[PDB]
Design a protein around this ligand. Structure first.
Ligand code: MG
Ligand code: MG
Ligand code: MG
Ligand code: MG
Ligand code: MG
Ligand code: MG
Ligand code: MG
Ligand code: MG
Ligand code: MG
Ligand code: MG
Ligand code: ZN
Lengths: 50, 241, 120, 68, 57
RNA sequence: CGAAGGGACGGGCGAUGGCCUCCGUUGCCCUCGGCCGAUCGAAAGGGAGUCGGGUUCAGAUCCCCGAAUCCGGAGUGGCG
RNA sequence: GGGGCUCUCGCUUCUGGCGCCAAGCGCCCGGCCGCGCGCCGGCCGGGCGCGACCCGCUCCGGGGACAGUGCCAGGUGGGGA
């Protein structure tokens, strides 16, 4: 509401205890539900990665 | 051999994004409460600033072997408990009318505790040895005693512990303990410590008064100013020769 | 070691909480049950619509205290009238006090109970 | 007595021994709440020439006041 | 039915006699079986091909 | 800018009260833990389960009669 | 064959899947058996260490003796009196 840009509800895997963590990333243009996004310094230079 | 073939190693691995992390010791990184952090950052801050020699001098205490022999000697001279003082006076005061009368009884040479007692003793040369604790938490009550025991000229020693002097005067803590007169059976034990103490404190006290303390850096800071040196000191010696 | 902090949070450890054992009671005696069986039931109703419900509906009707519930009313009728109670309906009147429609068991009937009470 | 030396040392608040203590304590006192009981007097001689004894029933509170 | 009346029902009226029955439809249960098979089967040929590439320096 | 969980079948060390064969409890020890914010806030929001007939000068989905239903409790088992 | 001194101390990129609460290798100790010749044969439990490197003094990163705050001084100030 009142922000005119979609948001990406991205679910990560928690690396310390067995849990799933959801996020609210700003949707880069061209992403779609069901693709994998990669966050970190070893991530490849693709659209959606952090 | 005859081991069960259904017993199998399944070695999990702990890379990034793989099987999750075990319960490893996190004791460096935890959220400590703000009285623990308050007293750990206090102890770091006494070694990050220039500590003056009137506060530095309570760090170079006496060695562990030769402070133990001091406490082994000053154990026969501990002040009596009231439970021995009351049991004596049920029999000592009994010996006035039956049958001694005067009974001067020769008040035994014992220890004398308290910073207000032992300062009176050194100002008129009564003291023989002034045992000082190092970690008085308001550290301003004994900052003049290495100054004062040098000028009056009695030996003094810094001893690693406040509640260890206190445990030999039947209280919780004790700041300073002073030795005065000693019995003739162990006077030679004093002329083993006194010439072994004042070579560390009285003979070298002009050395102490400019011996500043503290003023070292963090282990991250001292090892970041070693990479910049070793980067500089790998071609500048190679330039010559 | 061998103590280990397998959490980033310092929690306050639990200590020994022990029950009270006072040197003296704060009040000398337990206070008397001032809402007893005789303080529940004040007086019955003898109105023209109360006698009309004793006959056809097999039930007594009293004026009870405002503090009492349907369990204390069912026990106070059971004690000081020696009669058994099926159910109790209560209302608070616009007068201010509380009316109780106590219904008897089908064993008894309220027409020969009101004779003993004397409201008839 | 050793209270006469503490009385003269607190008259030397700009000395390098005493400016060090008045900064490490002021750091320590800044990290606590504004109402805070001290377990003992910080100045054991200044407290007792204002009516403090080392008996039971005399307590010490450290108060933090915004200056200006 | 409403969620608070779902506790006075018996067990067979709230699920289907199948793994993940009552939580997912059968179309995606059929997919997640052959995802977990084919991805782990792919991680065999990934594991063998780099292990058998131990012929160089 | 807080040491903000006083809980948990289980595991167990047991002080041990007994249909002490045990078995309901009990305290602490080892083990596990964010409803992460006390509490208030809707008789129109969310919120399990009652309807038909009869009945009074004035009350009824509430009282009678007849059909149901929900929630909780069942250790001494209430039977299949 | 090996070292030196810098890379290597990183193990996850075809897919809308699963992932915790230890396997294994040890070093012991119990309970019985019974080898009744001991690191030792048979059955059930409990613990510990490696798996999961070692030390350290700030939780981590970004500023930093500045910003900021206290006080005083000069300007500006119908925003207000
Ligand atoms: Mg009512
Ligand atoms: Mg079904
Ligand atoms: Mg909590
Ligand atoms: Mg409410
Ligand atoms: Mg409502
Ligand atoms: Mg409503
Ligand atoms: Mg009406
Ligand atoms: Mg910087
Ligand atoms: Mg103006
Ligand atoms: Mg004007
Ligand atoms: Zn699907």
């Amino acid at each position: 509401p009142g922000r005119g840009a979609p948001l990406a509800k991205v679910v990560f895997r928690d690396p310390y205890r067995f849990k799933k963590r959801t996020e609210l990333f700003i949707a880069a243009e061209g992403i779609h539900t069901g693709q994998f996004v990669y966050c970190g310094k070893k991530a490849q230079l693709n659209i959606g990665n952090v | 051999k005859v081991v069960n073939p259904l017993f199998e190693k399944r070695p999990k691995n702990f890379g990034i994004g793989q099987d999750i992390q075990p319960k490893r010791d996190l004791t460096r990184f935890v959220k400590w409460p703000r009285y623990i952090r308050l007293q750990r950052q206090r102890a770091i801050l006494y070694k990050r600033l220039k500590v003056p020699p009137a506060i530095n001098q309570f760090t170079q205490a006496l060695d562990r072997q030769t402070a133990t022999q001091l406490l082994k000697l000053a154990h026969k001279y501990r002040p009596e408990t009231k439970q021995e003082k009351k049991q004596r006076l049920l029999a000592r005061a009994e010996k006035k009318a039956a049958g001694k009368g005067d009974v001067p009884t020769k008040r035994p040479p014992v220890l004398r505790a308290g910073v207000n007692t032992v300062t009176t003793l050194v100002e008129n040369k009564k003291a023989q040895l002034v045992v000082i604790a190092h970690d008085v938490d308001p550290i301003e009550l004994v900052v003049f005693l290495p100054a004062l025991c040098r000028k009056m000229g009695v030996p003094y020693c810094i001893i690693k512990g406040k509640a260890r002097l206190g445990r030999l005067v039947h209280r919780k803590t004790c700041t300073t303990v002073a030795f005065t007169q000693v019995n003739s059976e162990d006077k030679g034990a004093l002329a083993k410590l006194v010439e072994a103490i004042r070579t560390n404190y009285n003979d070298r006290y002009d050395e102490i008064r400019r011996h500043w303390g503290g003023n070292v850096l963090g282990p991250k800071s001292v090892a970041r100013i070693a990479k910049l040196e070793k980067a500089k000191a790998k071609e500048l010696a190679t330039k010559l020769g | 070691k061998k103590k280990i902090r397998t959490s980033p949070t310092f929690r306050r450890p639990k200590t020994l909480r022990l029950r009270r054992q006072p040197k003296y009671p704060r009040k000398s005696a337990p206070r008397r049950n001032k809402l007893d069986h005789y303080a529940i039931i004040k007086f019955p109703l003898t109105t023209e619509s109360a006698m009309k419900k004793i006959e056809d509906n097999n039930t007594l009707v009293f004026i009870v205290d405002v503090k009492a519930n349907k369990h204390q009313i069912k026990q106070a009728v059971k004690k000081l009238y020696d009669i058994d109670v099926a159910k109790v309906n209560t209302l608070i009147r616009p007068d201010g006090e509380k009316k109780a429609y106590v219904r008897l068991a089908p064993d008894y009937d309220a027409l020969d109970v009101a004779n003993k009470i004397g409201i008839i | 007595g050793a209270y006469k030396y503490i009385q003269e040392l607190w008259r030397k608040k700009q000395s390098d021994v005493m400016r060090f203590l008045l900064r490490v304590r002021c750091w320590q006192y800044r990290q606590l709440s504004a109402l805070h009981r001290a377990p003992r007097p910080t100045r054991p001689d200044k407290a007792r020439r204002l009516g403090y004894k080392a008996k039971q029933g005399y307590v010490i509170y450290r108060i933090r006041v915004r200056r200006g | 039915v409403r969620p608070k009346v779902l506790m006075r029902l018996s067990k067979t009226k709230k699920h289907v006699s199948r793994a993940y029955g009552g939580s997912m439809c059968a179309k995606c249960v059929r997919d997640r079986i052959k995802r977990a098979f084919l991805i782990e089967e792919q991680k065999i040929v990934v594991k063998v091909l780099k292990a058998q590439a131990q012929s160089q320096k």
